[PDB]
Amino acid sequence: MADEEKLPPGWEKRMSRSSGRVYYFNHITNASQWERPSGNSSSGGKNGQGEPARVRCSHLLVKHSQSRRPSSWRQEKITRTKEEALELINGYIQKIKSGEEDFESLASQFSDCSSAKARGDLGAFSRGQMQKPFEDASFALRTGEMSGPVFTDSGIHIILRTE
């Protein structure tokens, strides 16, 4: 079995030893964890389908060589390739999921673009505005859980998610 009837909008309780205690696996964000998208705070919603109202999510970008912005926000050089660039993303995953830092110290103080200047240099759109690879996954959840390693024209993006 792979379902439930007592959880927030998103993630599906599996626990079928498909990795290591999937504990609610999101088919949209493709992320895993041992805690629902709320953590003793708020998990309301469950209205439509990823379109509760808006998203106004951010993006870390963090692009590498051969792309668009071959330069860091603090530095001024980039050579690492896609693979080597993937590691740069994990940094905002294992560290963020350390119950230490919040979701306001990754894209605001780290981002290979304008994002690393105004916290979230992305804004809200609600599909249609952005590109394909910036709507579906970006529609997952509706609070700020962030999805796995996505794929966008520039860099890779991690979708911080806010609303």
UniProtKB/Swiss-Prot annotation:
CDD domains: WW (cd00201). One of its GO terms (cellular component) is cytoplasm. GO terms for molecular function: beta-catenin binding; cis-trans isomerase activity; cytoskeletal motor activity; GTPase activating protein binding; mitogen-activated protein kinase kinase binding; peptidyl-prolyl cis-trans isomerase activity; phosphoprotein binding; phosphoserine residue binding. Keywords: Acetylation, Cell cycle, Cytoplasm, Isomerase, Nucleus, Phosphoprotein, Rotamase. It catalyses: [protein]-peptidylproline (omega=180) = [protein]-peptidylproline (omega=0). The keyword Thylakoid does not apply. Residues 52-163 form the PpiC domain. InterPro entries: PPIase_dom_sf, PPIase_Pin1, PPIase_PpiC, PPIase_PpiC_CS, WW_dom, WW_dom_sf. Expressed in immune cells in the lung (at protein level). The phosphorylated form at Ser-71 is expressed in normal breast tissue cells but not in breast cancer cells. Changing C113A: Loss of peptidyl-prolyl cis/trans isomerase activity; decrease in DNA repair of double-strand breaks by homologous recombination slightly less efficient than that observed with wild-type protein. No effect on RBBP8/CtIP. Pfam families: Rotamase, WW. Phosphorylation at Ser-71 by DAPK1 results in inhibition of its catalytic activity, nuclear localization, and its ability to induce centrosome amplification, chromosome instability and cell transformation. Ser-71 is dephosphorylated upon IL33-stimulation of dendritic cells. The modification Phosphoserine is found at S43, S71, S108. SMART domains: WW. One of its GO terms (biological process) is negative regulation of protein binding. Residues 5-39 form the WW domain. Residues 33-54 are annotated as: Disordered. This is Peptidyl-prolyl cis-trans isomerase NIMA-interacting 1. It comes from Homo sapiens. The lineage of its organism: Eukaryota, Metazoa, Chordata, Craniata, Vertebrata. The gene is PIN1.
